[model samples]
Target: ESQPDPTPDELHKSSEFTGTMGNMKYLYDDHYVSATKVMSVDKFLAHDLIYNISDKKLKNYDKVKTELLNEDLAKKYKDEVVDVYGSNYYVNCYFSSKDNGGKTCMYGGITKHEGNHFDNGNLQNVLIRVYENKRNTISFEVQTDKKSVTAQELDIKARNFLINKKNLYEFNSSPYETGYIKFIENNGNTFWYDMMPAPGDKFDQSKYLMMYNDNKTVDSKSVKIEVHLTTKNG
Candidate 1:
């Protein structure tokens, strides 16, 4: 099933994404952590932007899981899908004089906000943020590390050492799951494929997992993509 991109009007009307309860609570504390740790002010602002653009709770985990099990269901709704950012993607910092000498302790969570900037027919950069906790702050400081994509870039790199990999496959029971096919263009043509590898599926460099482009041909060298394989369980 194909769906139109949200029009400018629709996009404007769409409610701004909000942090989940867990995220909101974390941010509240992270703010305090930044004040105490005196970390990079720039990093804190970058992270704050991400916190402002994401939904707090898992909207429809169970539904997404169920759709994952059925191709038809998955195709019908593709907006609830999300990418598994990485392990330790969400982490907390400790400011306790009694614990680890105030070293920040990174843990696991999800990417809160992700977006790309485009200009002059070129890709500019991609930004994202994760949620974490703090021992002595109302909310913790956002992670300083971020992936920057340039117009000449062919791939985007993500740090997943702290992301919750186990939860990537877990299904929350909800009816709302998002999905979409990312497409790439070359020589006036487009191609698409999936991002998440199927269970027990080996990696294939030759074929796109989930993508679709009308004018492009499937060529191993000319294509790059990402998919937010989402699932919801009944």
Candidate 2:
């Protein structure tokens, strides 16, 4: 037998906003609440890494107590449990335009090694969401400071940035959840293009990437990108 998937309301019913953990605030005790505000992507991704609840072996503080710590130790170490949860140690990240000023938002997760294998088993996983409100049609574009790239080359390059071992983006099947890359124009080392939203939905979505700092300095291998949003009238 099969059961219906829970609605958003139902999904978040048990989650309670406990407090801020680290760079982000914990929206709920049991689960994370997504897209409460429009966040600067630079600052958004700049903070500590967010792990997908699905990817983690233990999902919450409660699990940390029972599964990782024995029953007697867990009860006695109540302060430690709160300390782990209260500190900005872990996050279950989600984003959507519905809650982000009818614009694009994202979910970013980092890979953690489990035994010899990383949970994601790869670095730089991202999920993106683009919104189109009744007032206008919305579009998003991405630009990199690397030497200018053509539309076709850009498509390939973006894929190389996003591709995983399975040849798929994080959550979705396609290489670009925003659909085909429509190159707009280029200025200096930067270029722009139209990244279409997934069809038949007000909110078009996508997903991860990470930059490791070494010797307290940024690496040249790091990829820096800019996201732009444009809108058209109804």
Candidate 3:
């Protein structure tokens, strides 16, 4: 017959921090524990049993130990074991906003492979969280820059910026051959765009032209451009 699950009151009867088994003391000793004591399940079972058994006969008792370790009989009595060891577990990269007059705009970058810029795209001031189940690792490179231009000119430049790499690569194999340009306005608001061909697509510059200027003649002094690059994910 199946037994009823223990109630919260029954579980909490022994202690406040850790519950006990009837009149017996219960010890919580794991990665999150502050101290170790005989009340610990691990201490009582592992240490006690190992100490009681003869070392000379340990090899012959392997089966017995294995059975005890695999048994589900003490499932409720078992305490969770966590290792609170530190490791180089995280890979993060960041870029701060550039000061445009008194206002600032933020940007982010990431490089997947050496000189591989495909992975670095469309990022602003943001925080991203990543989890690794195993010991997988990641790397990133980050950079930031500033740009300034009139609202009209900025819109035109954004329209003309190269976003597709396949188009850029048709003219130049080097990823660095093409450069990205952005425009910032005086109001702390910024608008920018890129011009590039999609990957695996042939570069047809004529088809991928940018129209930043709508027949409006703007002075060159009104435009400013800043750029930064970084590599990540090696």
Candidate 4:
């Protein structure tokens, strides 16, 4: 005996959350809903559950809850729940894109990490979602800069290139759902290609870009990034 898979309408229903399922974490709640395989059709679900929660609760004052009052509770739930501050890093390129006009794409999770291995090649653990700008496609050409890399190299250098196949919001606005964009390792050290939406029905349509640099170059391994991660709901 087999049951049919739920439809986008049946599974997600809608972003309105007609039911009582509110903000739940890790899909543990009865009403927890998220995107799925059909995103190719461009349908998704959400409840805005976080919006309903008060600001104080949403942020926990934007600080880790440490009063020494609930030391036991904090210790019990530290890693099991909450984020920010301490995180693990892996070998991979972390990236995302955003647009103010129609406003799509955002950075959610998978950024920095603490290194016991310190190898830096610790990515591939979390798949990053990098959406392209719909109106103006930005190219990360390999040969544009001093490290000038071209497409041929881009194809060879880039590793583990994973794409989102269901992104169908505004020609490319399916940030939260659909297949659109990719998680690629454009292994371009001296060269790289810009990544934007391609042509045709899906990203299968390839778009070419000219070589040009805005004189923007940063010496990798020469830069040090740091931050104090704050708990998500602390």
The top-ranked prediction according to lDDT is 2
Question: For every candidate structure, what is the RMSD over all alpha carbons to the true structure, in angstroms?
Answer: 20.0, 19.5, 32.0, 20.9
Candidate 2 — what's its lDDT? Answer: 0.23
Displacement of residue 119 (Cα, Å) in model 1 is 15
Please give the RMSD of candidate 2 to the true structure: 19.5
Model 3's lDDT to the true fold? 0.21
Q: Tell me the TM-score of model 3.
A: 0.23
Per-residue alpha-carbon lDDT of model 4 for 113-232, expressed as tens digits? 222122544321222223332232222222111122112222212211221222212222222221212222234223222222222232211112111111112222221111111111
Residue 63 lDDT (model 4): 16
Candidate 2 ranges beyond 4 A from true positions: 1-149, 165-191, 201-234
State every prediction's TM-score relative to the real structure: 0.20, 0.17, 0.23, 0.17
Best by TM-score: 3
- Could you give the candidate ranking by TM-score, starting with the highest? 3, 1, 2, 4
* Rank order (by lDDT, best first): 2, 1, 3, 4
Worst 10 residues of 4 by lDDT: 100-109
